[PDB]
Amino acid sequence: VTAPGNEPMAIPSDYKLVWADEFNTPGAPDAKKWRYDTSRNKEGWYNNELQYYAAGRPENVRVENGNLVIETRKERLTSMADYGGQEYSSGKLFTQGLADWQYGYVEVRAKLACGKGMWPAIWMMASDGSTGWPALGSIDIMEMVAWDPTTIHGTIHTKAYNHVIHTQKGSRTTAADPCGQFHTYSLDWTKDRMLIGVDGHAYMRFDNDHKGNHDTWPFDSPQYLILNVAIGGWGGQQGVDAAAFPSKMEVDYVRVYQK
Ligand SMILES: OC[C@H]1O[C@@H](O[C@H]2[C@H](O)[C@@H](O)[C@H](O[C@@H]3[C@@H](O)[C@@H](O)O[C@H](CO)[C@H]3O)O[C@@H]2CO)[C@H](O)[C@@H](O)[C@@H]1O
Ligand SMILES: [Ca+2]
Description:
Elements: E1 4-8, E2 16-21, E3 35-36, E4 51-53, E5 61-64, E6 67-74, E7 88-90, E8 92-94, E9 104-111, E10 118-126, E11 138-143, E12 151-157, E13 169-174, E14 183-189, E15 193-198, E16 201-207, E17 223-231, E18 247-258
Parallel strand pairs: 4-7
Antiparallel strand pairs: 1-16, 2-18, 3-8, 5-6, 6-7, 6-18, 8-17, 9-14, 9-18, 10-11, 10-17, 11-12, 12-13, 14-15, 15-16
The structure holds a molecule of 3 linked components (GLC-BGC-BGC) and calcium ion.
PDB class: hydrolase
Keywords: glycoside hydrolase, transglycosylation, endo-1, 3(4)-beta-glucanases, metagenome, hydrolase
Assembly: monomeric
């Protein structure tokens, strides 16, 4: 644990709900709120990931019964022009180009995708990617790898602090049946620090050292929100279980609060 936290977190009294997807409207996700990422479908995604991210394909991404569903399936989508030879299909939505925020309280109420192989993530990257990943800054509000399906990881990545050179600032907790019941995964982002939590408890704290160094604190610029279920890489440490497909993360809501 490299960024330990141990404090309550709650939507601050002086914050307003400024953006939300309650996923009230069945069908396609709202195009004013999400776009699909197909950027590396043909090439293969990073982290040696095994999924194809299917755009506009209800089998992988749909709003149903108040939830965003992101669903992994074992299938080869060979009719897709950007098909990259993948054994699996999944979904990746982001608010890139639609919505971002500089500081704020983010609350995502979600049931995760389980099964050896599955790697559900709720995270943020900076709107200004001029510095690239990992320099731009990225916030992992929730990662789980389903070989360890009760363990919730909360992580930040910057130039100084990132997985590529094993200096990432993160922590972990556990949650009851995270693929069978809903938890709130939460980020409290101020100019001074980040808390990352489950259910109103921060297990993760990263402070702005206030040195004005982009390397250690790139978090004074807007960030957009990302929802996906990756397959393989970190999620594939105890292999990929054919039997576990299909597997789905249900997102009840995304709610963003600001001063
Ligand atoms: O490898 C260099 C390329 O990185 C691309 O950035 C990726 C990065 O490679 C990848 O490892 C990273 O993965 C993320 C996880 O490690 C963790 O942060 O949680 C995220 C949710 O699981 C997960 O996807 O993502 C980076 C951004 O996609 C650069 O985009 C590319 O320009 C560069 O050459
Ligand atoms: Ca809902």
